[PDB]
Paper text:
Two-pore channels (TPCs) belong to the voltage-gated ion channel superfamily and function as a homodimer, with each subunit containing two homologous Shaker-like 6-TM repeats. However, several recent studies have demonstrated that mammalian TPCs are sodium-selective channels activated by the endolysosome specific lipid phosphatidylinositol 3,5-bisphosphate (PI(3,5)P2) rather than NAADP. Like other TPC channels, HsTPC2 functions as a dimer with each subunit containing two homologous six-transmembrane domains (6-TM I and 6-TM II). Here we present the cryo-EM structures of human TPC2 (HsTPC2) in both the ligand-bound and apo states, which reveal the structural basis of phospholipid binding as well as its activation mechanism.
Interestingly, the single particles of HsTPC2 in the presence of PI(3,5)P2 can be partitioned into two classes of particles, and 3D refinement yielded HsTPC2 structures in the open and closed conformations at 3.7 Å and 3.4 Å resolution, respectively. The 3:5 ratio of the particles between the open and closed conformations in the PI(3,5)P2-bound structure of HsTPC2 likely represents the ligand efficacy of channel activation. The HsTPC2 ion conduction pore adopts both closed and open conformations in the ligand-bound state. In the open state, these constriction-forming residues dilate and rotate away from the central axis, resulting in a much wider opening at the intracellular gate. In the closed state, the IS6 helix breaks into two halves at Gly317, just below the cytosolic gate, while in the open state, IS6 becomes a long continuous helix. Upon ligand binding, the Arg329 side chain adopts an extended configuration to form salt bridges with the PI(3,5)P2 phosphate groups; this interaction provides an outward force to pull the IS6 helix into the straight conformation; meanwhile, Ser322 forms a hydrogen bond with the C5-phosphate of PI(3,5)P2 to help stabilize the IS6 helix in the open conformation. In the ligand-bound, closed state, Arg329 forms a salt bridge with the C3-phosphate, while in the ligand-bound open form, Arg329 forms salt bridges with both the C3- and C5-phosphates as well as a hydrogen bond with the C4 hydroxyl group; additionally, Ser322 forms a hydrogen bond with the C5-phosphate only in the open conformation. Between the two IS6 residues that interact with PI(3,5)P2 in the open state, Arg329 appears to play the determinant role in channel gating as its mutation (Arg329Ala) almost completely abolishes channel activity whereas the Ser322Ala mutation reduces the channel activity to a lesser extent. The movement of IS6 from the closed to open state results in the outward dilation and rotation of gating residues (Tyr312 and Thr308) at the bundle crossing. Interestingly, we also observed two long stretches of density plugging the open gate in the open HsTPC2 structure.
Residue numbers in the entry:
A (entry chain B), B (entry chain A): 39 to 240, 252 to 346, 354 to 525, 539 to 608, 620 to 701
């Protein structure tokens, strides 16, 4: 009856879930399995992965606008303030796509599963309180600067991906073991300020208690390492032993225990979670076996239906072709459950595909050429001339600088460059014969090479059309692309190839743990906008201050300058100066914001991002 | 005959070599085994370990002398130049102790073993060329500044210790696998200077090729991270993406691959060498079995001689007592070789020793007290009052600063401090009754506590004798010791105890890999003296230069200021300024010295020192 195909559609959903590591917890009906295949297709999810990009992009356009060519305070125009209809209009279109998504994700699962899963409760309460905020931002007037719904926008990014859920749970089970050091770092920082204030009371860095605390917090990351030593080391030579002992205990040892203790528990709890992701793979092969053995209602499956199921599944070609021969390889056997999971080990075989070389209408001139050009020396001799073009730019660049920069001689550089553009033209025209245009475009290193020979050919005739011999600007862009062209020797050489190829593999694991950085920037910038928006005005400074250096571009006026001021605080150089500005301009209690940013960004996250990659880099050798 | 005791003295030397991991490769005679026990005793080797400290200490006294209270150039006196007899006289006494050491180490081993061992050849040629240099430094006159024998002085430190030999071999088998990145870091640094010079040619950091190279080398370690961005980011907002991409590739990723690749091969080759050190331990038990089984000339040993051999060996008490009962535990058994190495597994048992509490002549008042004081709460309530004394200093220190620092009120702090000195007096006088003076001095935490109660008692009556109520200076040293006293809560608390106790265990492994830092400082300081000795003279500066900041104390005039200028270069903050000074003062070719110092100190050594400790810290949990 109708139980034949219903067992089949119960089997296609399980084996496709067995590929992409999703939990087998559904409300399996006839109609829902039509809905399930459409939601996890690459046409519906590529709009959900597109609209999350749009709402985070909407911070570039809102009323503290960032569409200005500069970012100074001394000279910048007014940014184009948009009319306040179109700002909030594109928000509500991108919220009525998540209003469909929560209803689909909730209908496909049980209501009992809904009440136990705390993400979907959090996906609910965030969606409602944003919808109340969209009313009140329209209802009174479009003049409220404080937009609370802008803070909740990274929650839609964390809800989508299934690995940023895992590593956020993973950080929570490592911070309780941090407290044996975070207490130990506090007593070390608190004893040295009282011991520091008594020694130099018989320099202006220690004439106060909150200054001497904030001057040893800066020394803890060595951001002012000679400057805090000088007026006490010049007085007596033995006072340098106070600051030598402090940086050895605190900066070199205690700050590095905070890295190693957090990571060694981060490695333990993560591998337990990634072990769970492998468990759902073997359950999908297991759950497919139960319904297909129930098609009879020995202990096995009839191979006649097994042609039909792997025909319908979404896969590659050779992954489908090897499976379709092996199900044809048997007759009337009853494929057991261990034999069923003997079958699906094919999915971990990396495959290679290449196109055949092209012949011509003639024999003898054809065969003599591809014996030479395919020997991987023709793109080795092309590497040497790429170095020959690069040194001529360097020879040009060290003789003009001894003269005024008005470029007395440009003709010599032009008549050597145009020869090399003819040379780069011959590499494209010859190799397309040696491999065929479908084969020459198949290798991705030649796509990077073949594209740049086109743009150099376009630009060289362009400057020769106007100037038969902006002309300094036109020959400037020509030489920049040649230095960009020199990157081709990185995949070509033998030792540089494997270090490039492994990092290209780790981009499929950078997608998860790099996505948290977008969450941490987005929270601190909007809070950073709503605290220091217009607190810097520019209307003879001391030589070390925020004003003597021309640091006016590191404001917090708009979302594009907030993501650069927060960048120069992640690298921890010279952040004694921002604590001098944003204390003198916006009160002494602003230092809790920057100290919290130094704890989240440059201590916890950056080390745990690089330890996660550079372990997985060397593990893959 | 005389073969009885000769087999015995052949057995004492092997089992003592089985304890301290020395190779069983000797010229075993009758007379040499008298010499061998004296050379590896703790009375001869504690002079060899003392005279190596002396020659490195002699750099503090030689003719660029470092006996000056300050280290400026603006104001310092002439250092006391010693008469040139006594400088070179103490050197030759410390060279005629190594002239005995090479002859003893060579006579005890074979001449065939001498020719194959390259350390003893290096110990020879260094010893001779220093002896020629001691003549020529005396023979013409004591006026040659260049002392080549001062460079060779760390070789006597590397020759003595048997683990700095191992890790120096270990670094050599990791640098060949560095070259896949050191080439990759060079092309990345060389492409960005030509691409950088063309973009800003349509700021003064890029108007030259050697300046733009040395300005991106500084950016590679983020020592000038906002300062190099400013004049191009204020011009146009999109130019910040040039410096964001550069620090992500180079500073955060490529500089960290240089740490992880070197360490992951440093971990591999070191554990192979430490495995070899365990191999000599089981050979010493094996080589002792062969001679004692040859005392018969079943398959075993007679236990009658085995009382005599472990009686003569140098060991501890319980390590000797447990062995002396087990050899007495058997009768006429023939102890086999596996039974012989069944015996010597006792040497890996950490032992505890404690002294009994002391009673008095009376029963009832005695028993009521030690039920209370030994409950580890009496030194918990002592921790709270130590926090109560510390907060009163903090309450004092935040109210004087709002006034002028002439200390209007000191009487209030004095009449609370003297109460706490009586309180700290009662902790010593009561606990010495509760445990006995031999037991109270047995625990090392009470030695640190009991000593500071004496010095506070000495100082408190001292300021009260002169001043019945320098007096600000006398009450200053009193409050400093109280903050020093607060360190006692670190071993007392539960979570802080295990993090303190493990690092105290790692000092017996810090002795090896920390000794290389003394070699790297000693080479670069003497070279640093002989290149920039008197090249800084002080006779309105730009606001960012070496002269506006008062950096005059970071000279290279003497060996004590060289070890501080090299310290502020190991921490890599503000070393753009030294490259501005020591290029403008001593030629542009001095930058090879500082760049080589940044490669050896703050890239290779510091990371490999901390990765070696903080792995072994967390491995011991
Ligand atoms: C904003 C108003 C309230 C909203 C707050 C929302 C907070 C919230 O619901 O999370 C609950 C879940 C727990 O619930 P839980 O369900 O366990 O969280 C994960 C998801 O279920 C995930 O399901 P998939 O999406 O299908 O992958 C599963 O794979 C993971 O298991 P695994 O580890 O074996 O891989 C779970 O760890 O995770 C937390 O425990 C939060 C800890 C956050 C750490 C903070 C770091 C500072
Ligand atoms: C100055 C004029 C010339 C003098 C130069 C002297 C250079 C020199 O003789 O060393 C030879 C030995 C090789 O000879 P080698 O004997 O193998 O060096 C070690 C010692 O014998 C050591 O003997 P003990 O003292 O009894 O402990 C032994 O334990 C180690 O084995 P192990 O690894 O299994 O623990 C050996 O690695 O070690 C080098 O291979 C030098 C590499 C230096 C790396 C430089 C780093 C940049």
């Amino acid at each position: 009856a109708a139980r034949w195909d219903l067992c089949i559609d119960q089997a296609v959903v399980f084996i496709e879930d067995a590929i992409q590591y999703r939990s087998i917890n559904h409300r399996v009906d006839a109609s829902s399995m039509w809905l399930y295949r459409r939601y996890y297709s690459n046409v519906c999810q590529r709009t959900l992965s597109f609209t999350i990009f749009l709402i985070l992009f909407l911070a570039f356009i809102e009323t503290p606008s960032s569409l200005t060519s500069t970012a100074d305070v001394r000279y910048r125009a007014a940014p184009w303030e948009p009319p306040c209809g179109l700002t909030e209009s594109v928000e509500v279109l991108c919220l009525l796509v998540f209003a469909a998504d929560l209803s689909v994700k909730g209908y496909l699962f049980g209501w009992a599963h809904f009440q136990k899963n705390l993400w979907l409760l959090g996906y609910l309460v965030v969606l409602v309180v944003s919808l109340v905020d969209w009313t009140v931002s329209l209802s009174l007037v479009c003049h409220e600067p404080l937009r609370i719904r802008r803070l909740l926008r990274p929650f839609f990014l964390l809800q989508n991906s299934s690995m940023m859920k895992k590593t956020l749970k993973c950080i929570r089970w490592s911070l309780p073991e941090m407290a044996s050091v975070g207490l130990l770092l506090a007593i070390h920082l608190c004893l040295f300020t009282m011991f520091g204030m008594l020694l130099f009371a018989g320099l202006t860095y220690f004439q106060n208690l909150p200054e001497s605390l904030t001057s040893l917090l800066v020394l803890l990351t060595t951001a002012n390492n000679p400057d805090v030593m000088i007026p006490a080391y010049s007085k007596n030579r033995a006072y340098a032993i106070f600051f030598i002992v402090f940086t050895v205990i605190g900066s070199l040892f205690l700050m590095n225990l905070l890295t190693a203790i957090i990571y060694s528990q981060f490695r333990g709890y993560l591998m337990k979670s990634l072990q769970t992701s492998l468990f759902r793979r073997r359950l999908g092969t297991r759950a497919a076996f139960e319904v297909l053995s129930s098609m009879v209602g020995a202990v096995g499956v009839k191979p006649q239906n097994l042609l039909q199921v792997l025909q319908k599944v979404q896969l590659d070609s050779s992954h489908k072709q090897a499976m379709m021969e092996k199900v044809r390889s048997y007759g009337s056997v009853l494929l057991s459950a261990e034999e069923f999971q003997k079958l699906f080990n094919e999915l971990d075989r990396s495959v290679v595909k290449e196109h055949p070389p092209r012949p011509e209408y003639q024999s003898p001139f054809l065969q003599s050429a591809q014996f030479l050009f395919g020997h991987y020396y023709f793109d080795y001799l092309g590497n040497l001339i790429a170095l020959a073009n690069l040194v001529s730019i360097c020879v040009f660049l060290v003789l003009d600088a001894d003269v005024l920069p008005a470029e007395r001689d440009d003709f010599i550089l032009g008549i050597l460059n145009c020869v090399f553009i003819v040379y780069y033209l011959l590499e494209m025209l010859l190799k397309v014969f040696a491999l065929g245009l479908r084969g020459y475009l198949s290798y991705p290193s030649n796509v990077f090479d073949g594209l740049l020979t086109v743009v150099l050919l376009v630009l060289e005739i362009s400057t020769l059309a106007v100037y038969r011999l902006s002309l300094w600007d036109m020959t400037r862009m020509l030489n920049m692309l040649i230095v960009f062209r020199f990157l081709r020797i990185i995949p070509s050489m033998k030792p540089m190839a494997v270090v490039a190829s492994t990092v290209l593999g780790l981009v499929q694991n950078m997608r998860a743990f790099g996505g948290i950085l977008v969450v941490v920037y987005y929270v601190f910038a909007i809070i950073g906008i709503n605290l220091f928006r217009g607190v810097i005005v520019a209307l003879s400074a001391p030589c070390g201050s925020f004003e003597q250096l021309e640091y006016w571009a590191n404001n917090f006026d708009d979302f594009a300058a907030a993501l650069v001021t927060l960048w120069n605080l992640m690298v921890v150089n010279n952040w004694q100066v921002f604590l001098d500005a944003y204390r003198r301009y916006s009160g002494p209690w602003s230092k809790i914001y920057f100290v919290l940013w130094w704890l989240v960004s440059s201590v916890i996250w950056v080390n745990l991002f690089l330890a996660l990659i550079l372990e997985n880099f060397l593990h893959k050798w």
